[PDB]
A paper describes a structure:
Self-labeling protein tags such as HaloTag are powerful tools that can label fusion proteins with synthetic fluorophores for use in fluorescence microscopy. To engineer the binding site, ten amino acids on helices 6–8 in close proximity to TMR were chosen for randomization by site-saturation mutagenesis. The changes in spectroscopic properties result from single or double point mutations in the direct vicinity of the bound fluorophore.
The brightest variant, the double mutant HaloTag9 (HaloTag7-Q165H-P174R, ΔI = 19.9 ± 0.5%), as well as the dimmer variants HaloTag10 (HaloTag7-Q165W, ΔI = −52.9 ± 1.2%) and HaloTag11 (HaloTag7-M175W, ΔI = −44.8 ± 0.8%) were chosen for characterization with a panel of 46 different fluorophores and analysis of their photophysical properties. The decreases were more pronounced for HaloTag10 than for HaloTag11 but in both cases caused by changes in quantum yield. HaloTag10 and HaloTag11 decreased the brightness of all fluorophores relative to HaloTag7, HaloTag10 having the biggest effect. We therefore recommend the use of HaloTag9 and HaloTag11 for multiplexing of two species and HaloTag9, HaloTag10 and HaloTag11 for multiplexing of three species.
Author numbering: 3 to 294
The structure:
Amino acid sequence: GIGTGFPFDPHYVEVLGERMHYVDVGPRDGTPVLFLHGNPTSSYVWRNIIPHVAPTHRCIAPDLIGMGKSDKPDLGYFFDDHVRFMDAFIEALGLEEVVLVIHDWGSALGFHWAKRNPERVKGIAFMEFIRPIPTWDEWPEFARETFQAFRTTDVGRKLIIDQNVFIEGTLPWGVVRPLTEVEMDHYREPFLNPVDREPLWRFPNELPIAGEPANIVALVEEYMDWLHQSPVPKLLFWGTPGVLIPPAEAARLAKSLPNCKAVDIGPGLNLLQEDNPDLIGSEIARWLSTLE
Ligand SMILES: [Cl-]
């Protein structure tokens, strides 16, 4: 049975006038490992992978601004907002060199930070990450009508903000195996008040789909161009059928990206961490040992 508890002691750092929550476990020496979550999760999504890495490495998993146990100021919560906060989070913790373990929107932050700081990244493990979606035909059929609704200010805000559809609908429909009530309540916890659900709506409105928004497509195309050139060791977890990364796209990127190893986790949609945390955690620890 996949674990449901969150036993990590809370840590907080002040940043741009707000406090951000982060997990900090493992031995201090070595290269720290930085876990970046996405929408609509938090560091809770890493709770069963970190125990495979914490024996030998320091594990840092922050809650994005406006999410988890972090502060929730009245922001627009655009992707630029998360960039400015994650930039100053990494600097506030004195993280000189890091290994990235990123997912969903945490991967957009991780890849964009790596492009701007390539000398400070010693490895990138990633899964179901932000890539350009050329047309809506490359988006999964069963989720197309829902995400097109999300990307409007009338229907999309009614579903995500008023009815909490991204937590009540999108989250369980992004995991193959059934979630428990305790696991749902952990994801419901940061967004009990509808006024705090702004990040849950802006994030899908930022997804680079069909060239829109053009500023996010351009940004993702740049760090995807840097990925193809960089020699940084890469670990690519993928699931079947997946959501953002279909198996065929993972097969192409495993061979086209330099020093990229691909791992099949079995059945999976978007939250691969909830479908096979033991394989993901153990494969990260093994892969870290082959980098020294
Ligand atoms: Cl999203």
